[PDB]
Symmetry: C2
Subunit: 69 residues, 2 copies
């Protein structure tokens, strides 16, 4: 169960995204930071144990205006 | 280049750890959440691109009283 989140600032977005997951009490298994080029832009790939956790994350991140897949 | 951090609250500690990394402007490549039992205790395994980033992270987390390896 994976969710991919496009981000403009890998470092700051990582902190914001994990604070959102914490507030919603969503457990994750892994967080991978992907990039096509060196620089601050990237994709956060978040892995979950359960489908329910992925959907909860998708909703919460969507509400904070992150584009998610 | 990996750093292992013991935590008491996987969900909240993940947010705290990434906020510290943000404060120090440290980029990471991966974060894996490991647990021995279902429940809040665990170990965060953090991967870095460079040795300098690992050491910077180790120092900053140490200063916030996390036990690190
Ligand atoms: Ca609660
Ligand atoms: Ca700062």
């Amino acid at each position: 169960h994976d969710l991919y989140v496009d981000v403009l600032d890998k470092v700051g977005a990582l902190a914001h995204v994990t604070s959102i997951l914490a507030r919603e009490e969503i457990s994750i298994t892994n967080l991978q930071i992907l990039e096509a080029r060196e620089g601050l832009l990237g994709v956060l790939r978040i892995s979950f144990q359960r489908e329910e956790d992925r959907m909860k994350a998708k909703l919460a991140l969507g509400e904070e205006k992150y584009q998610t897949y």
